[PDB]
Design a protein around this motif. Structure first.
Motif, PDB file in Angstrom:
ATOM      1  N   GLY A 176       0.851  -1.218   0.000  1.00 44.90           N
ATOM      2  CA  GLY A 176       0.000   0.000   0.000  1.00 44.90           C
ATOM      3  C   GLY A 176       0.861   1.233   0.000  1.00 44.90           C
ATOM      4  O   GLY A 176       2.046   1.153  -0.006  1.00 44.90           O
ATOM      5  N   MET A 177       0.224   2.340   0.054  1.00 46.02           N
ATOM      6  CA  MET A 177       0.907   3.619   0.019  1.00 46.02           C
ATOM      7  C   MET A 177       1.256   4.099   1.405  1.00 46.02           C
ATOM      8  O   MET A 177       2.382   4.195   1.739  1.00 46.02           O
ATOM      9  CB  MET A 177       0.025   4.647  -0.707  1.00 46.02           C
ATOM     10  N   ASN A 178       0.266   4.446   2.207  1.00 47.13           N
ATOM     11  CA  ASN A 178       0.527   4.899   3.540  1.00 47.13           C
ATOM     12  C   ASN A 178      -0.742   4.767   4.402  1.00 47.13           C
ATOM     13  O   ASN A 178      -1.775   4.473   3.855  1.00 47.13           O
ATOM     14  CB  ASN A 178       1.142   6.354   3.590  1.00 47.13           C
ATOM     15  N   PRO A 179      -0.640   4.896   5.725  1.00 46.41           N
ATOM     16  CA  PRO A 179      -1.815   4.611   6.553  1.00 46.41           C
ATOM     17  C   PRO A 179      -3.026   5.468   6.327  1.00 46.41           C
ATOM     18  O   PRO A 179      -2.887   6.661   5.942  1.00 46.41           O
ATOM     19  CB  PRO A 179      -1.307   4.936   7.947  1.00 46.41           C
ATOM     20  N   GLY A 180      -4.210   4.894   6.495  1.00 46.90           N
ATOM     21  CA  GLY A 180      -5.402   5.725   6.636  1.00 46.90           C
ATOM     22  C   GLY A 180      -5.511   6.031   8.094  1.00 46.90           C
ATOM     23  O   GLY A 180      -5.088   5.308   9.020  1.00 46.90           O
ATOM     24  N   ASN A 207       2.984  -1.484   3.957  1.00 46.68           N
ATOM     25  CA  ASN A 207       2.886  -0.164   3.324  1.00 46.68           C
ATOM     26  C   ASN A 207       4.274   0.293   2.885  1.00 46.68           C
ATOM     27  O   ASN A 207       5.221   0.095   3.614  1.00 46.68           O
ATOM     28  CB  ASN A 207       2.369   0.888   4.304  1.00 46.68           C
ATOM     29  N   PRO A 213      -1.121  -2.631   8.376  1.00 44.61           N
ATOM     30  CA  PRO A 213      -1.552  -2.100   7.059  1.00 44.61           C
ATOM     31  C   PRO A 213      -3.013  -2.433   6.746  1.00 44.61           C
ATOM     32  O   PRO A 213      -3.505  -3.519   7.016  1.00 44.61           O
ATOM     33  CB  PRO A 213      -0.624  -2.788   6.027  1.00 44.61           C
ATOM     34  N   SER A 226     -11.699   0.952   3.206  1.00 50.17           N
ATOM     35  CA  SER A 226     -10.602   0.383   2.399  1.00 50.17           C
ATOM     36  C   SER A 226     -10.065  -0.898   2.998  1.00 50.17           C
ATOM     37  O   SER A 226     -10.096  -1.969   2.355  1.00 50.17           O
ATOM     38  CB  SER A 226      -9.470   1.357   2.196  1.00 50.17           C
TER      39      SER A 226
HETATM   40  O1  XAN Z   1      -2.217   0.792   5.231  1.00 52.65           O
HETATM   41  C1  XAN Z   1      -2.905   1.311   4.390  1.00 52.65           C
HETATM   42  N1  XAN Z   1      -2.347   1.611   3.208  1.00 52.65           N
HETATM   43  C2  XAN Z   1      -2.992   2.196   2.246  1.00 52.65           C
HETATM   44  O2  XAN Z   1      -2.475   2.533   1.174  1.00 52.65           O
HETATM   45  C3  XAN Z   1      -4.320   2.541   2.505  1.00 52.65           C
HETATM   46  N2  XAN Z   1      -5.263   3.136   1.788  1.00 52.65           N
HETATM   47  C4  XAN Z   1      -6.358   3.122   2.531  1.00 52.65           C
HETATM   48  N3  XAN Z   1      -6.134   2.527   3.737  1.00 52.65           N
HETATM   49  C5  XAN Z   1      -4.884   2.157   3.769  1.00 52.65           C
HETATM   50  N4  XAN Z   1      -4.113   1.532   4.656  1.00 52.65           N
END
Ligand code: XAN
Length: 240
Positions: free
Chosen positions: A59-63, A139, A73, A113
Protein backbone atom coordinates in the motif's frame (compact mmCIF):
# COMPACT_ATOMS: atom_id res chain seq x y z
CA UNK A 1 25.11 -1.94 6.37
CA UNK A 2 23.44 -4.03 9.05
CA UNK A 3 21.99 -7.50 8.35
CA UNK A 4 18.24 -7.63 8.32
CA UNK A 5 17.25 -10.62 10.41
CA UNK A 6 13.56 -10.09 9.95
CA UNK A 7 10.82 -7.65 9.30
CA UNK A 8 10.99 -6.09 12.70
CA UNK A 9 14.64 -5.10 12.10
CA UNK A 10 13.60 -3.59 8.81
CA UNK A 11 10.77 -1.58 10.39
CA UNK A 12 13.02 -0.37 13.21
CA UNK A 13 15.70 0.74 10.66
CA UNK A 14 13.01 2.51 8.65
CA UNK A 15 11.71 4.37 11.77
CA UNK A 16 15.26 5.52 12.51
CA UNK A 17 15.75 6.74 8.97
CA UNK A 18 12.40 8.58 9.17
CA UNK A 19 13.21 10.22 12.49
CA UNK A 20 16.02 12.23 10.89
CA UNK A 21 13.71 13.70 8.21
CA UNK A 22 12.02 17.07 8.28
CA UNK A 23 8.71 18.11 6.83
CA UNK A 24 7.28 21.61 6.61
CA UNK A 25 4.18 23.46 5.56
CA UNK A 26 1.76 22.44 4.45
CA UNK A 27 2.75 19.47 6.72
CA UNK A 28 2.04 20.39 10.32
CA UNK A 29 1.82 16.94 11.90
CA UNK A 30 3.52 13.61 11.20
CA UNK A 31 2.28 10.38 12.78
CA UNK A 32 4.56 7.29 12.97
CA UNK A 33 2.59 4.18 14.07
CA UNK A 34 5.90 2.23 13.99
CA UNK A 35 6.63 4.08 17.20
CA UNK A 36 3.28 4.52 18.91
CA UNK A 37 1.70 1.23 17.86
CA UNK A 38 4.83 -0.83 17.97
CA UNK A 39 3.51 -3.81 19.93
CA UNK A 40 0.60 -4.54 17.59
CA UNK A 41 2.76 -3.79 14.51
CA UNK A 42 5.47 -6.21 15.62
CA UNK A 43 2.78 -8.75 16.45
CA UNK A 44 1.58 -8.56 12.87
CA UNK A 45 5.16 -8.76 11.48
CA UNK A 46 6.12 -11.67 13.71
CA UNK A 47 2.94 -13.73 13.54
CA UNK A 48 2.24 -13.31 9.81
CA UNK A 49 5.41 -12.08 8.12
CA UNK A 50 7.65 -15.15 8.31
CA UNK A 51 9.61 -15.72 5.08
CA UNK A 52 9.41 -16.77 2.32
CA UNK A 53 6.31 -15.35 0.65
CA UNK A 54 5.30 -15.75 -2.96
CA UNK A 55 3.51 -12.39 -3.24
CA UNK A 56 3.85 -9.02 -1.47
CA UNK A 57 1.07 -6.46 -1.54
CA UNK A 58 2.28 -2.91 -1.00
CA UNK A 59 0.00 0.00 0.00
CA UNK A 60 0.91 3.62 0.02
CA UNK A 61 0.53 4.90 3.54
CA UNK A 62 -1.81 4.61 6.55
CA UNK A 63 -5.40 5.73 6.64
CA UNK A 64 -6.28 7.62 9.76
CA UNK A 65 -8.75 5.01 10.99
CA UNK A 66 -6.80 1.91 10.05
CA UNK A 67 -3.03 1.50 10.33
CA UNK A 68 -2.80 4.92 12.19
CA UNK A 69 -4.93 3.26 14.90
CA UNK A 70 -3.83 -0.38 14.92
CA UNK A 71 -0.27 -0.49 13.46
CA UNK A 72 -1.44 -2.94 10.81
CA UNK A 73 -1.55 -2.10 7.06
CA UNK A 74 -5.17 -1.50 5.96
CA UNK A 75 -5.81 -2.34 9.57
CA UNK A 76 -9.49 -1.73 10.17
CA UNK A 77 -10.01 -2.27 13.92
CA UNK A 78 -12.57 -5.01 13.70
CA UNK A 79 -10.74 -7.16 11.22
CA UNK A 80 -7.41 -6.82 13.05
CA UNK A 81 -8.96 -7.82 16.40
CA UNK A 82 -11.41 -10.49 15.15
CA UNK A 83 -9.53 -12.13 12.27
CA UNK A 84 -5.86 -11.53 12.99
CA UNK A 85 -6.24 -11.70 16.76
CA UNK A 86 -4.24 -8.63 17.45
CA UNK A 87 -5.28 -6.04 20.06
CA UNK A 88 -2.61 -4.23 21.98
CA UNK A 89 -1.09 -1.01 23.38
CA UNK A 90 -1.30 2.03 21.19
CA UNK A 91 -0.21 5.38 22.54
CA UNK A 92 -0.92 8.82 21.07
CA UNK A 93 1.49 10.43 18.64
CA UNK A 94 3.36 13.60 19.69
CA UNK A 95 1.27 16.50 18.58
CA UNK A 96 -1.78 14.37 17.76
CA UNK A 97 -4.38 16.55 15.96
CA UNK A 98 -7.81 16.67 17.51
CA UNK A 99 -9.54 15.87 14.23
CA UNK A 100 -7.37 12.69 13.89
CA UNK A 101 -7.13 11.25 17.35
CA UNK A 102 -5.42 7.90 17.92
CA UNK A 103 -7.79 5.90 20.09
CA UNK A 104 -6.13 2.62 19.07
CA UNK A 105 -8.19 -0.49 19.48
CA UNK A 106 -10.91 1.64 21.05
CA UNK A 107 -11.39 3.54 17.76
CA UNK A 108 -14.97 3.27 16.69
CA UNK A 109 -14.50 4.44 12.91
CA UNK A 110 -14.37 1.53 10.45
CA UNK A 111 -12.05 2.10 7.56
CA UNK A 112 -13.77 1.04 4.34
CA UNK A 113 -10.60 0.38 2.40
CA UNK A 114 -9.12 -2.06 4.90
CA UNK A 115 -12.49 -3.62 5.62
CA UNK A 116 -12.84 -4.37 1.99
CA UNK A 117 -9.26 -5.65 1.51
CA UNK A 118 -9.04 -7.84 4.55
CA UNK A 119 -12.63 -8.92 4.22
CA UNK A 120 -11.95 -10.17 0.67
CA UNK A 121 -8.86 -11.95 1.86
CA UNK A 122 -10.83 -13.59 4.65
CA UNK A 123 -13.50 -14.69 2.20
CA UNK A 124 -10.93 -16.12 -0.27
CA UNK A 125 -8.62 -17.81 2.30
CA UNK A 126 -10.60 -18.42 5.46
CA UNK A 127 -7.77 -18.39 7.96
CA UNK A 128 -4.88 -16.14 8.30
CA UNK A 129 -2.51 -19.11 7.99
CA UNK A 130 -3.82 -20.00 4.50
CA UNK A 131 -3.14 -16.40 3.37
CA UNK A 132 0.13 -15.73 4.99
CA UNK A 133 1.52 -19.05 3.87
CA UNK A 134 2.08 -17.30 0.52
CA UNK A 135 1.19 -13.63 0.91
CA UNK A 136 2.05 -10.55 2.93
CA UNK A 137 0.78 -6.94 3.09
CA UNK A 138 2.95 -3.92 3.83
CA UNK A 139 2.89 -0.16 3.32
CA UNK A 140 5.54 1.67 1.37
CA UNK A 141 5.36 4.65 3.77
CA UNK A 142 4.41 4.17 7.37
CA UNK A 143 3.85 7.87 8.15
CA UNK A 144 0.59 9.82 8.10
CA UNK A 145 0.95 13.54 7.12
CA UNK A 146 -1.57 16.22 8.14
CA UNK A 147 -2.05 19.92 7.54
CA UNK A 148 -2.40 22.27 10.45
CA UNK A 149 -6.18 21.88 10.04
CA UNK A 150 -5.96 18.11 10.32
CA UNK A 151 -6.33 17.35 6.56
CA UNK A 152 -4.62 14.35 5.09
CA UNK A 153 -1.58 14.98 2.85
CA UNK A 154 -0.70 11.94 0.62
CA UNK A 155 2.98 11.50 0.06
CA UNK A 156 2.81 12.30 -3.63
CA UNK A 157 1.82 15.95 -2.59
CA UNK A 158 4.93 16.65 -0.49
CA UNK A 159 7.43 19.20 -1.80
CA UNK A 160 10.13 17.43 -3.87
CA UNK A 161 12.91 18.35 -1.40
CA UNK A 162 11.19 16.52 1.42
CA UNK A 163 9.78 13.75 -0.78
CA UNK A 164 13.18 12.66 -2.05
CA UNK A 165 14.72 11.68 1.31
CA UNK A 166 11.37 10.11 2.43
CA UNK A 167 11.31 7.97 -0.72
CA UNK A 168 14.98 7.07 -0.34
CA UNK A 169 14.29 5.66 3.14
CA UNK A 170 11.05 3.87 2.02
CA UNK A 171 12.72 2.41 -1.09
CA UNK A 172 15.51 0.97 1.01
CA UNK A 173 13.00 -0.63 3.44
CA UNK A 174 11.08 -2.08 0.49
CA UNK A 175 14.17 -3.55 -1.09
CA UNK A 176 15.13 -5.06 2.27
CA UNK A 177 11.61 -6.52 2.60
CA UNK A 178 11.85 -8.12 -0.81
CA UNK A 179 15.33 -9.55 -0.17
CA UNK A 180 14.01 -11.11 3.10
CA UNK A 181 10.63 -12.43 1.91
CA UNK A 182 11.73 -13.38 -1.56
CA UNK A 183 8.47 -12.91 -3.39
CA UNK A 184 7.97 -13.70 -7.07
CA UNK A 185 5.50 -10.81 -7.50
CA UNK A 186 5.06 -7.43 -5.80
CA UNK A 187 1.67 -5.85 -6.23
CA UNK A 188 1.00 -2.19 -5.63
CA UNK A 189 -2.44 -1.45 -4.20
CA UNK A 190 -3.21 1.65 -6.28
CA UNK A 191 -1.16 3.54 -8.78
CA UNK A 192 1.12 5.42 -6.39
CA UNK A 193 2.22 2.25 -4.67
CA UNK A 194 2.68 0.48 -8.00
CA UNK A 195 4.92 3.30 -9.25
CA UNK A 196 7.07 3.23 -6.12
CA UNK A 197 7.47 -0.56 -6.45
CA UNK A 198 8.70 -0.25 -10.08
CA UNK A 199 11.11 2.53 -8.98
CA UNK A 200 12.47 0.77 -5.91
CA UNK A 201 12.73 -2.77 -7.26
CA UNK A 202 14.10 -2.37 -10.80
CA UNK A 203 16.69 -5.05 -11.42
CA UNK A 204 15.41 -7.38 -8.82
CA UNK A 205 14.18 -10.73 -9.98
CA UNK A 206 10.49 -9.90 -9.23
CA UNK A 207 7.53 -8.93 -11.31
CA UNK A 208 5.62 -5.82 -10.32
CA UNK A 209 1.90 -5.29 -10.93
CA UNK A 210 -1.09 -3.38 -9.62
CA UNK A 211 -4.51 -3.99 -8.29
CA UNK A 212 -7.29 -1.41 -8.01
CA UNK A 213 -7.28 0.39 -4.67
CA UNK A 214 -10.31 -0.49 -2.50
CA UNK A 215 -11.29 3.07 -1.48
CA UNK A 216 -14.60 4.50 -2.43
CA UNK A 217 -12.73 7.08 -4.50
CA UNK A 218 -12.87 4.62 -7.43
CA UNK A 219 -16.14 3.71 -8.96
CA UNK A 220 -15.14 0.17 -9.81
CA UNK A 221 -14.25 -0.41 -6.19
CA UNK A 222 -17.77 0.43 -5.17
CA UNK A 223 -19.37 -1.71 -7.70
CA UNK A 224 -17.23 -4.83 -7.39
CA UNK A 225 -13.77 -4.29 -5.85
CA UNK A 226 -13.20 -7.97 -5.21
CA UNK A 227 -14.16 -9.09 -8.69
CA UNK A 228 -12.05 -6.48 -10.25
CA UNK A 229 -8.99 -7.25 -8.17
CA UNK A 230 -9.53 -10.92 -8.72
CA UNK A 231 -9.38 -10.33 -12.47
CA UNK A 232 -6.26 -8.25 -12.22
CA UNK A 233 -4.53 -10.89 -10.20
CA UNK A 234 -5.38 -13.57 -12.65
CA UNK A 235 -3.96 -11.41 -15.45
CA UNK A 236 -0.79 -11.16 -13.39
CA UNK A 237 -0.54 -14.95 -12.85
CA UNK A 238 -1.38 -14.78 -9.20
CA UNK A 239 -3.49 -17.48 -7.51
CA UNK A 240 -5.97 -15.97 -5.09
O1 XAN B 1 -2.22 0.79 5.23
C1 XAN B 1 -2.90 1.31 4.39
N1 XAN B 1 -2.35 1.61 3.21
C2 XAN B 1 -2.99 2.20 2.25
O2 XAN B 1 -2.48 2.53 1.17
C3 XAN B 1 -4.32 2.54 2.50
N2 XAN B 1 -5.26 3.14 1.79
C4 XAN B 1 -6.36 3.12 2.53
N3 XAN B 1 -6.13 2.53 3.74
C5 XAN B 1 -4.88 2.16 3.77
N4 XAN B 1 -4.11 1.53 4.66
Amino acid sequence: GPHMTGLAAISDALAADLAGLSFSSPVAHVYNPLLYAREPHVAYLSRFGSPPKEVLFVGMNPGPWGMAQTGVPFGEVAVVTEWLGINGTVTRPAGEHPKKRVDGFACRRSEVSGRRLWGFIRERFGTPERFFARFFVANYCPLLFLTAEGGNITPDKLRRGEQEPLFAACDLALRRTVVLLRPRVVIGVGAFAEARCHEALEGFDVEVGRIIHPSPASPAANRDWAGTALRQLAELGVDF
